């Protein structure tokens, strides 16, 4: 039994509330908006990691369903909102390293998250970051929910996906980490599109329009357009303020447009930018 519920968040498939149990301990309660829930729970049961939110139980009334989770005070979106255009370097490095550890573990366990964004990245007062919201995730090829345009935001979607690739891949999440990385350093989203078409153009405007030299077989993508406006790639220093050479190198390897060229979570953790 839980009480003193207070709305702290809202996604598409449920409302999240802060609540107390009968001993005064705080948890997060996700009321579902009524098999998709069973698939999400199976993922949460499988994944046990410092940087992934823990599920504690599931209460099934006939007219009510609630997932009980550990509670974190904040998410990254709120930290960025209050923040003066971007976090401090040491903090940004710390969140990225934790995000990378969490996602590397996910990928090792055959889980694609597919909806990483500041809102789904939870942070406590100790500066620990935990990945949440596996409602669009995919575990060894079986989706929690069918991946589509309409629900999910566009801002953190990879160019290949936007152009109609149904080629699943861990690559989808690496693209999102890169966008989130950029947003932590600048304080603002790198690619805030309001449609699929505008999202792609925003990506090309900064990183350059793909061609067959830098993205082999790009012409085969369902929504590749021969007549895309051609944009040259921008120098990384011109749209990222105050990121050192190593941080730019790592970032350039996450936001490769061609998914085959993107760095892996595992390789990223080994990059000179962190200790190693
Ligand atoms: O403490 C938490 N535990 C969980 C667990 C699961 C989710 S989920 O995204 O709904 O899956 C969200 C949360 C959660 C959240 N804590 C907060 C605090 C401020 C703003 C938003 C959220 C939030 O979504």
Annotate the chain with three-state secondary structure: CCEEEEEEEEECCEEEEEEECCCCCEEEEEEECCCHHHHHHHHHHHCCCCCECCEEEEEECCCCEEEEECCCCEEHHHHHHHCCCCCCHHHHHHHHHHHHHHHHHHHHCCEECCCCCHHHEEECCCCCEEECCCCCCEECCEECCCCCCCCCCCCCCCHHHHCCCCCCCCHHHHHHHHHHHHHHHHCCCCCCCCCHHHHHHHHHHHHCCCCCCCCCCHHHCCCCCCCCCCCCCCCHHHCCCCCCHHHHHHHHHHCCCCHHHCCCHHHHHCCCCCCC
**By C-alpha distance, which of 276, 274, 218 is closest to 99?**
274
Tokens of 9: 């968040």
User: What dotted CATH number matches 74-276?
Assistant: 1.10.510.10
| Contact status, residue 140 vs residue 155, Cβ threshold 8 Å | no
Q: How far is the CA of 7 from the centre of ligand 1 (A)?
A: 10
Q: CA–CA distance from 177 to each of 11, 26, 84, 180, 242 (Å)?
A: 20, 29, 21, 5, 18
Catalytic residues: 115
Give 203: exposed, middle or buried? Use CB within 10 Å, 0-12, 13-18, 19+. Answer: buried
Q: Quick one: which atom of ligand 1 is closest to the CA of 11?
A: 10
Q: Is 9 near ligand 1, meaning CB less than 6 Å away?
A: yes
Experimental method: X-ray
Q: What fold characterizes domain 1-73?
A: Phosphorylase Kinase; domain 1 (3.30.200)
| Contact status, residue 15 vs residue 7, Cβ threshold 8 Å | yes
The number of CA neighbours under 13 Å toward the Cβ of 55 is: 19
* CA dihedral over 198, 188, 127, 244, signed as positive or negative: positive
| Contact status, residue 181 vs residue 251, Cβ threshold 8 Å | yes
Tokens of 259: 């998914």
**By C-alpha distance, which of 125, 81, 117 is closest to 99?**
117
Q: Is 28 near ligand 1, meaning CB less than 6 Å away?
A: yes
Q: Quick one: which atom of ligand 1 is closest to the CA of 30?
A: 10
Q: CA–CA distance from 41 to each of 139, 147, 205, 268 (Å)?
A: 11, 18, 40, 28
Who's near 9: CB < 8 A, 6+ residues apart? 15, 16, 75, 119
Candidate from 44, 70, 72 with most ligand 1 atoms within 8 A of CB, to mutate:
72
Q: Is 32 near ligand 1, meaning CB less than 6 Å away?
A: no
**Residue 26: beta bridge partners?**
20
| Contact status, residue 11 vs residue 153, Cβ threshold 8 Å | no
CA distance 206 to 236: 9
| Contact status, residue 18 vs residue 9, Cβ threshold 8 Å | no
**Per the annotation, does 11 bind a ligand?**
yes
CB atoms within 10 A of CB 176: 23
What is the separation, in whole angstroms, between the first and last Cα of the chain? 46
Which residue's CA is minimally distant from atom 2 of ligand 1?
A: 71
| Contact status, residue 252 vs residue 182, Cβ threshold 8 Å | no
Q: How far is the CA of 225 from the centre of ligand 1 (A)?
A: 39
CA distance 141 to 199: 26
Candidate from 67, 102, 132, 137 with most ligand 1 atoms within 8 A of CB, to mutate:
132
**By C-alpha distance, which of 270, 263, 235 is closest to 97?**
270
CA distance 153 to 43: 22
Q: Quick one: which atom of ligand 1 is closest to the CA of 70?
A: 3
CA distance 41 to 59: 12
Tokens of 120: 């789904």
CB atoms within 10 A of CB 177: 24
Q: At what angle do helices 171-186 and 89-108 cross, to 10 degrees?
A: 170
Q: Where in the chain is the domain with CATH 1.10.510.10?
A: 74-276
Q: Where in the chain is the domain with CATH 3.30.200.20?
A: 1-73
| Contact status, residue 254 vs residue 177, Cβ threshold 8 Å | yes
Which residue's CA is minimally distant from atom 24 of ligand 1?
A: 9
């Amino acid at each position: 039994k839980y009480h003193g519920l207070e709305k702290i968040g809202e996604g598409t498939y449920g409302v999240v509330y802060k609540a107390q149990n009968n001993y005064g301990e705080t948890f997060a309660l996700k009321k579902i908006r009524l098999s998709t829930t069973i698939r999400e729970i199976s993922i949460l049961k499988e994944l046990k990691h410092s940087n992934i939110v823990k599920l504690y139980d599931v209460i099934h009334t006939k007219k009510r369903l609630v997932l009980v989770f550990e509670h974190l005070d904040q998410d990254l979106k709120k930290l960025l909102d209050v923040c003066e255009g971007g976090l401090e370097s040491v903090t940004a490095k710390s969140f990225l390293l934790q995000l990378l550890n969490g996602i590397a573990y996910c990928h090792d366990r055959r889980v694609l998250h597919r909806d990483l964004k500041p809102q789904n990245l939870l942070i406590n007062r100790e500066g620990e970051l935990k990945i949440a919201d596996f409602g669009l995730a995919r575990a060894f090829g079986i989706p929690v929910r069918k991946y589509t345009h309409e629900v999910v935001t566009l801002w953190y979607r990879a160019p290949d996906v936007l152009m109609g690739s149904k080629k699943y891949s861990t690559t989808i999440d690496i693209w999102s980490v890169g966008c989130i990385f950029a947003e932590m350093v600048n304080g603002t989203p790198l690619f805030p599109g309001v449609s699929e078409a505008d999202q792609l153009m925003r990506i090309f405007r900064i990183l350059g329009t793909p061609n067959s030299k830098n993205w082999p077989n790009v012409t085969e993508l369902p929504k590749y357009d021969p007549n895309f406006t051609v944009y040259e790639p921008l120098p990384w220093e011109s749209f990222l303020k105050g990121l050192d050479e190593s941080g730019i190198d790592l970032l350039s390897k996450m936001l490769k447009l061609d998914p085959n060229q993107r760095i892996t979570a595992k390789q990223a953790l080994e990059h000179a930018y962190f200790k190693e």
